[PDB]
Design a protein around this ligand. Structure first.
Ligand SMILES: CO/N=C(\C(=O)N[C@@H]1C(=O)N2C(C(=O)O)=C(COC(C)=O)CS[C@H]12)c1csc(N)n1
Length: 260
């Protein structure tokens, strides 16, 4: 059975696995530790980008607003922002970089624009997400210490919210579409959820990773002949320097989407 397969995967893996699959054909779910908290790491970037998209619904100039990039802004992982030092990036470009490259500078610019991690949390609450919490900026939001509630959510909460954001009620249509375009264009997820799915399926995703071998991915999946699936796979380990384990996420994806 799918629960037995997940249990065994977890057992073998040396960690703690959290899975929430929502099948939008019938709102059925596959849940494994889905009400337990995990450090989100960069999966939290979706909430900050979406909060900016929500603002853009009532401000037509916002996404083209230029933001200065200073060498001072750079932190530990800045693939896109480092190319624009001494220049500017628009808020749309910052959303794109945060989601498609997991740029940490870009996420900090989003957070600062919004008025701090608390504001990201309030945006999640406005969507009916009672679980999400953003407490820190980049890079410290990825410390992923076992039992630390900062910068955490549950698999089910994040699957529900990702569904609302990408397929449902959270954003007006142009902004929903923009979020989906960004997720589909992610460059960091090939060995995660995507690797456990049929090649022909269309996928948008956002990865996350941190200490304690914390290895995460959240995805919206469009099968060729079926309604979409929303899948959250979170994974963490007991030792601070554990290797990250994207293969576990791919394996979980295969287990829960194999029965199609
Ligand atoms: C103190 O901050 N520590 C981080 C960290 O910055 N995590 C963030 C996060 O999630 N990111 C993702 C991410 O989305 O997974 C990638 C991934 O980018 C790519 C190209 O794969 C790059 S690191 C950034 C970290 C990461 S691993 C570890 N021990 N710590």
């Amino acid at each position: 059975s799918v629960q037995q397969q997940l249990e065994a995967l977890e057992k073998s893996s040396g960690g703690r696995l959290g899975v929430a699959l929502i099948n939008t054909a019938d709102n059925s779910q596959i849940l494994y530790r889905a009400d337990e908290r995990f450090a989100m790491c960069a999966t939290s970037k979706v909430m900050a980008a979406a909060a900016v998209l929500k603002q853009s619904e009532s401000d037509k100039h916002l996404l083209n607003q230029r933001v200065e990039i200073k060498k001072s802004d750079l932190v530990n992982y800045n693939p896109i922002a480092e190319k624009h030092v001494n220049g500017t990036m628009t808020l749309a470009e910052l959303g794109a970089a945060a989601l498609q490259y997991s740029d940490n500078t870009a996420m900090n610019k989003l957070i600062a624009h919004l008025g701090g991690p608390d504001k990201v949390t309030a945006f999640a609450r406005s969507l009916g997400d009672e679980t999400f919490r953003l407490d820190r900026t980049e890079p410290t939001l990825n410390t992923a210490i076992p039992g630390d509630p900062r910068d955490t959510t549950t698999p089910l909460a994040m699957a529900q919210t990702l569904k609302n954001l990408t397929l449902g009620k959270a954003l007006a249509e142009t902004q929903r579409a923009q979020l989906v375009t960004w997720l589909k264009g992610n460059t960091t997820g090939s060995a995660s959820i995507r690797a456990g799915l049929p090649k022909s399926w269309v996928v948008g995703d956002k990865t996350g990773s941190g200490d304690y071998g914390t290895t995460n991915d959240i995805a919206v999946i469009w099968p060729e002949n079926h309604a979409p699936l929303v899948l959250v796979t979170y994974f963490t380990q007991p030792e601070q320097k554990a290797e990250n384990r994207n293969d576990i996420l791919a394996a979980a994806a295969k287990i829960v989407t194999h029965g199609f």
